[PDB]
């Protein structure tokens, strides 16, 4: 027959992002006792030191996917007083744009009760949502 018709019906997709994009990947259900819950594929982590503000998107193994930091010269030279609410909003906007470039659209954010009621991170979340990045990662198919 046609040489191109060979299929090998057991197809192997080596892309690690494949199952996460189809939302059939294995979420890390579990602990329940410790915090935060590690049932996700990507997680937003905001670190607010006394000088700089650093927003990470981390995979469940702990590596850094995309980060937006006030320590970076691009935001440092364009923004004054990198500790403000405006600094958090700018970091959130930059991170949302970088996530759109990276092709990631869903992530989880689990702030503390005193952190979710703050002004800087409320506007950070608002900027992240307005930038196209939506939280509440979709439910796993056949969880």
């Amino acid at each position: 027959p046609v040489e191109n018709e060979a299929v090998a019906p057991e197809f192997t997709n080596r892309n690690p992002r494949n199952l996460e994009l189809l939302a059939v990947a294995r979420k890390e259900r579990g602990w329940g006792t410790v915090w935060p819950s590690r049932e996700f594929w990507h997680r937003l982590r905001v670190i607010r030191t006394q000088h700089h503000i650093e927003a990470l998107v981390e995979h469940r193994n702990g590596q850094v996917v995309v980060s937006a930091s006030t320590r970076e010269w691009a935001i440092k030279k364009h923004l004054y007083s990198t500790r403000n609410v405006v600094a958090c909003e700018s970091v959130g906007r930059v991170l949302a744009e970088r996530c759109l470039e990276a092709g990631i659209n869903f992530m989880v954010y689990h702030p503390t009760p005193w952190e979710a009621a703050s002004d800087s991170i409320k506007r950070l979340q608002h900027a992240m949502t307005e930038g196209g990045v939506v939280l509440r990662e979709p439910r796993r198919i056949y969880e």
């Binding site: 939302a23 759109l100 470039e101 659209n105 869903f106 196209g132 990045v133 939506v134 979709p138």
Partner: peptide
């Protein structure tokens, strides 16, 4: 289809 709509909107943004 929410995921498809969101990804379509986000890729349209670019």
């Amino acid at each position: 289809l929410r995921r498809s709509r969101i990804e379509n909107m986000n890729r349209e943004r670019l």
